[model samples]
Target chain A: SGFRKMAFPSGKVEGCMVQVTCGTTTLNGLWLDDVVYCPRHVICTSEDMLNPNYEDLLIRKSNHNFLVQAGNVQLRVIGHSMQNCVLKLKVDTANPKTPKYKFVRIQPGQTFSVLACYNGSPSGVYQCAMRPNFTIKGSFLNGSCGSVGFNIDYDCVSFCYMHHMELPTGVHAGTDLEGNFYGPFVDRQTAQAAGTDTTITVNVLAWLYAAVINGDRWFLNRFTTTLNDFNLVAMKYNYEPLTQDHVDILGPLSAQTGIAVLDMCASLKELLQNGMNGRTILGSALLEDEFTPFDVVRQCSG
Target chain B: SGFRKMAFPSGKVEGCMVQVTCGTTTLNGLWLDDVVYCPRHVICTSEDMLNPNYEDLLIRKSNHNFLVQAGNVQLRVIGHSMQNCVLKLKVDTANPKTPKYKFVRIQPGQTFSVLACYNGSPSGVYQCAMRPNFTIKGSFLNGSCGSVGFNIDYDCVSFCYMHHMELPTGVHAGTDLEGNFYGPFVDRQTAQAAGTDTTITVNVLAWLYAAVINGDRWFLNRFTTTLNDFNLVAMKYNYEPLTQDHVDILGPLSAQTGIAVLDMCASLKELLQNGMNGRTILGSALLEDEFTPFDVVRQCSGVTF
Candidate 1:
């Protein structure tokens, strides 16, 4: 169980999530089946790849610090879990159909570092949350949050979390619960198990607006480059593609509009630790993962 | 002949802008032909009605005061256009047909009330604005603005005003130009003449919640009574007729959601006087006529005035 370095192609898509299989060796108690396809190539282990499954297992590299955006997303490690576990950091990104992974080892006091952004297209952020298999009906969101980020100002945030209809607590009551920014269900045992992918669909134009305003030019470069490839579109009339002519994004970004889209990846441990309050959705990536994206400035309701 | 007070049923469908016509009589300087068919009926003069197209005209009547809401919608007469205009106070409403007249009259000092609302249902506000004979393209909207009405906080407003795309006046830069909220074209003469009805369509759920949240219970009381009778829906898939199931009003409002809907209505004089700068779309209502239902809300970048 030693650490080694490996490298792969950088076309893992942009911010996508993929499944990592290790044959018989499981890292940090997880199948590595669920991991952030962050790096094009990374460091890996030998024992894990000695058979049918484990080939390339290096997760989350170092360059994402500047490559990944806090507005777009941020990641963190669950301090307590590392104390007892094998430093299982599943990493970031969204969905389970993308590719590539880098395996590495971390010490308990590593201080943590950002690996790489999710490997899929930013548009998938909308689709992964919108048609999450939950009956194909997703809720519509304003997508526009002000300058406020999501963590500290949890009450005034808009990342897609799980809260019962009338929880009488947190954002619904216009505030936060306990001292936590993302309120209850730190682990997502309950959320994912619910089986319904009740994702939140935002106005694509608004999403694009934030991307442009925040100067996330890379998103536009990638987005416009493959404008036709976004897994889903907010306004597709009848499954018909929406063209630039259908909408006009010519003006300056209005500061008044802001929206947040986070990973639906939460862990089972985070849930058991948080007392399972009505805010069922957990934060960023699985609480068990190494680092997950976090960007709350796009606060709404404030 | 002097103005006579003839009364009619207030079937005024709150917020309908109509086109008022005068065969020989012209109220103010312009004839009613130039008016927008925003209302149902109107008040008339003697010579104008005694011919082939002549009859009793009842303009906006009682109830639009408290009965009216700025959030839902409200209308006020343009102060400058008040004097010498025949006191020819006419009002607006919807429905009748594709063409012709719906007339009614009110006294000069009577605050100019609403006659009949648009003949169609309020749900159709979306249809009228969306499909406005424009060639098949429609715009999507946030359609969600909470307790925050469009007035006082002028900056965060979206009305269907006229603009030529890159107008530097309003909806951007966060300030008004030359005392006007958005620009120089306060009146709408240039807009109506353009002959294109450019409008905005917002998230429907948010808009309806406002309709219900504002204690529009009667609308719902009678609304849910016939909730199933709203004819056809504005947005449907496969051109499929939109049914109730197509929408969801469940759970509590997210305090985090709100949207507004308004007519690209501007004042009459606001159009004729403002030099019609790029601010083509006036504040609210057709160029000149009864209290044409103009919400002047759902204001965006002042897209197409």
Candidate 2:
């Protein structure tokens, strides 16, 4: 309940009266087609943003994976469509992020990019990460669309990752063959995907977990199996040190959350895993981008 | 049976099939217009020349005068009009002129100018002179209309003399009281109307001949006569070479041709000819230019070129 509001910056801004207040200055009702960041209002509801029917506050994050850094998180939003797009996002705590959330009313089919800052220190460890929330609104021109209201957190440690297998040569820590990666998740710069990560990631792990719970032997075999023999060569080649402490916490966390990691060693062991890129997982880039491991596995498993 | 053809050139040309046979070419059609010595055709007909229900070979010389050298007996033609005009001419002898006379059609109420190029050889003629001819085509965009054609032959000459008379040098040769000069009949080089001199000369001569034949003394007294005498001292100052020979032949050509020489010394004798400089004559270097004698007289007669 301790979510701090994302402060706005004055840069390429747009949306009708989507004003952003930065320091001593608070300007409103800016340009229409400007390339912008976190616009705070819309022409249709600038002055009376409090009005419920103005219907402009709409923010929906696609169910795309948003990996996170264990600390100092910031939100990065990438959206597209000319209109029928209403994205209202805010990082609110007890007092609420704002009297109301900020909005961008996209016309028919439009494109938008936004940002939110995660500036406060965490409160405790009831949770290792704060799973942000979102809701939906209208339709999109490309398909149908909506609006919703929405960060990732890392705990028990100082930053995002705790144990990553690696060679002494820093380059060797990713998933074997794919190189140093995943778990708490991240941006290419390795920060959390803000209002997105867990919702989308857990969604994937949830889907795969369901399939696994259903006793999909085909999946268990073609993708992953029980790790009994600690074959050192395979282990040494891949995970330099499979620590008991890290795996202890990880295993139970997945069980409680119903999210599980797919081991690369058995990911597609004997399955015809060819040409399975992002497209087969989600949709095209214009719609969905990060279709991660679980999404890919569910995709191949089915 | 009596139709001649015009010559043609290879280059592009237009204007009612008017064609030509350049020095290097020869071709024919039942008809057409092209440059030649004399076209016996017209859009009109003339004296003793055959009249035919056939169209007059109206080969308009396009106003370019054809003054056949009288000594070689060539033909000259002149004509003008807004549209309706006719003129025929020719010059053919041993050197292959043409088989039969070619014709150009002529309609009624037309303007035309054609000529007579008399043949003769020089023999103490006191003349290496050029005799250009001219004619009245349509009612001059200025004067009345007429029908006839004519010339000037100088056995030895004195008029329209090539030069002198730029200012009041005060030597006189005009109407008894008037002095003579130029700017009257002249081209820019100041040659009188280019090749139009004598042709127009005789045409005027022919008119006077007509008046004389009709004994129109009214025209005479009002125009001629004061020529009975040329007091030598008077002749002395003006006709520097009143050598009597040039004057002799000039006098007779007028009498014989029934065309009389208009004495500049007598024309408009009573009218004060002040500044009778060229500028006041028939007005330009192109028309009644340098008209001396009768032609000169007629020019002085009425035309104030």
Question: Cα-based RMSD of the predictions, in order?
Answer: 27.9, 51.3
What lDDT tens digits, residue by residue, belong to model 1 across residues B1-305? 00001111111221222222233221111112222221111223344323312122332222221121122233232211112112222224222322222322211111111111111111111111212222111111111100000111121212221111111111110011111212222221123221222222222233333333332212121112122222222222112222343233212232322321111111111222342342211111112111112211111111111
Per-prediction DockQ comes to 0.01, 0.00
lDDT tens string, model 2, A203-240?
22333333344333233333343343322322432322
What digit string (tens of lDDT, one per residue) describes model 2 on residues B136-242? 11111000011111112222111121111111111111000011122232111122331222222222233333334322222333344323343332332222222
Q: What are the runs in model 2 whose C-alpha is more than 4 Å off?
A: A1-18, A21-207, A214-217, A222-250, A253-265, A268-302, B1-305
Docking class of 1: incorrect
lDDT of 1: 0.20
How badly does each model clash, as a count of residue pairs? 103, 92
> Candidate 2 chain B: minimum summed lDDT over ten consecutive residues — where?
B1-10
Candidate of highest DockQ? 1
DockQ score for model 2: 0.00
Which tens-of-lDDT digit does each residue in A1-302 have in candidate 1?
Answer: 00001101111222232222223221111112333221111123344322312122322323222122222344331111111112233445333423343333211111111111112111111111112221111111121101011111211212222111111110110011111212221221123222322212222333333333433322222112223433243223212233443223212232333321211001111232342232311111111111111111121111
Per-model TM-score on C-alpha atoms: 0.19, 0.16
